[PDB]
Amino acid sequence: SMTFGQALESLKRGHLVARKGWNGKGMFIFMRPEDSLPTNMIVNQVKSLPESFKRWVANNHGDSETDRIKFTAYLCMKAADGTIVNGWLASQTDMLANDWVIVE
Amino acid sequence: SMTFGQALESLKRGHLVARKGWNGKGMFIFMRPEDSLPTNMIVNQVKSLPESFKRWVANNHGDSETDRIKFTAYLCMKAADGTIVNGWLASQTDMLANDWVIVE
Amino acid sequence: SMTFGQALESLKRGHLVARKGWNGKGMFIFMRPEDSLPTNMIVNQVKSLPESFKRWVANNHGDSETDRIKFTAYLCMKAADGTIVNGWLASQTDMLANDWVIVE
Amino acid sequence: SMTFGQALESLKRGHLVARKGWNGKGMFIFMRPEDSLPTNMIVNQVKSLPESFKRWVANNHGDSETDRIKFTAYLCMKAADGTIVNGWLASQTDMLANDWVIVE
Numbered sequence A, B, C, D: 001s002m003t004f005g006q007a008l009e010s011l012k013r014g015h016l017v018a019r020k021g022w023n024g025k026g027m028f029i030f031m032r033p034e035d036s037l038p039t040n041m042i043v044n045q046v047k048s049l050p051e052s053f054k055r056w057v058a059n060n061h062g063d064s065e066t067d068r069i070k071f072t073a074y075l076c077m078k079a080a081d082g083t084i085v086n087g088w089l090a091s092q093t094d095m096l097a098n099d100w101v102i103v104e
């Protein structure tokens, strides 16, 4: 019923959207919000970054409280098997389709 | 400036679109339309398909019975260096951006 | 069972590959090869390009000087419903999986 | 000068990798690891998920511990302007390229 752009505008407001085909398998997508993080937190606290990246941040920014790093918003899918797929991609099919709806 | 949804609606209409934010200059994206091709043509006439795929089509359809295979519409990018990138992908930043403009 | 990297090398040599889960649906992916096209052919002959792009090519190459425009190689998918999806894109799951198989 | 497949195996080991060909300067990609999270932490503690998804999880899992939800590994890009792009996806050019180098 909706185009992919309308779904995108619904995602940016924090809603869960889906294509009609996905309903049988119960899949939906949602947006994880952008955030800005201080470099000291990235180096010393964040669990979910590989050590090499944290070392790079220390090499360049050097554990400053003032220095901040932007982490972009992105799309995630609640896939059929229940797991959360971070970094969801729109296929050509998905982009050009008009069977998008809002789950919640 | 438009949303990616509005850029997509332009693309479906035949328009060339780009993002001001894109680092490269002169880069734009366009949509190539959908076409249904007869199986005999796919196996014999088409030179842009690999031999394994053509063999598969021949095994399945036998170049007979007026069988036709749809090839879907897809986005493509005229990149900075003049090459045409078939099958352009929208990055999270692209999908969520609102600095899209029509180029033609 | 192969990694996505091995799947890719097999794609570059013209093979049909798939993930094991895809088998029930019958899906597979393959590479369409790259090719350079003369701009007069693009402007005057190619059916699968939109008018605006043909005009851009005319205005920027002149349909003269034997200018050749490259069209990159790219992946496509034979999808569940039989149609050929141009411009297949790998999910995060696809890229990081090691359940890839050669189909042909 | 490595394949995307070799870059991917380096990314699985936690390294930072990149392409010489990329237009912007100083960019690289890295993998954020897979994690499994108890549903009560997802509902009551995680700040970076929309409230609609927290609601969905609570309605389906009832705020129970030892009910866990997997969050997949995924690729991220340290972009040219210093922001981290969550959910980086490979373009046809990136996948089929052989100019990959280990940054760290």
Ligand SMILES: Nc1nc2c(ncn2[C@@H]2O[C@@H]3COP(=O)(O)O[C@H]4[C@@H](O)[C@H](n5cnc6c(N)ncnc65)O[C@@H]4COP(=O)(O)O[C@H]3[C@H]2O)c(=O)[nH]1
Binding pocket: A032, A033, A034, A035, A037, A045, A046, A047, A048, A049, A071, A072, A086, D033, D034, D035, D037, D045, D046, D047, D048, D049, D071, D072, D086
């Ligand atoms: N918006 C945003 N915030 C982020 C990002 N990366 C880290 N953060 C912030 O840093 C906090 C600490 O991260 P952590 O990796 O040390 O522990 C995180 C992480 O271990 C886990 N988690 C949440 N989503 C995850 C995910 N998608 N993959 C793996 N782990 C995840 O839950 C913990 C608490 O999440 P949270 O969102 O409330 O707080 C994050 C979050 O607020 C990010 O990429 N985007």
Ligand SMILES: Nc1nc2c(ncn2[C@@H]2O[C@@H]3COP(=O)(O)O[C@H]4[C@@H](O)[C@H](n5cnc6c(N)ncnc65)O[C@@H]4COP(=O)(O)O[C@H]3[C@H]2O)c(=O)[nH]1
Binding pocket: B032, B033, B034, B035, B036, B037, B045, B046, B047, B048, B049, B071, B072, B086, C033, C034, C035, C037, C045, C046, C047, C048, C049, C071, C072, C086
């Ligand atoms: N809409 C559509 N039509 C297709 C597709 N694949 C093949 N076709 C049709 O079959 C014709 C012959 O394909 P070819 O490979 O033998 O020669 C093609 C091909 O060799 C070349 N060409 C155009 N775009 C190309 C490209 N992106 N990559 C490689 N070659 C390309 O131009 C020729 C003529 O294109 P066309 O659009 O006028 O006719 C196509 C086209 O109408 C397709 O994926 N989508």
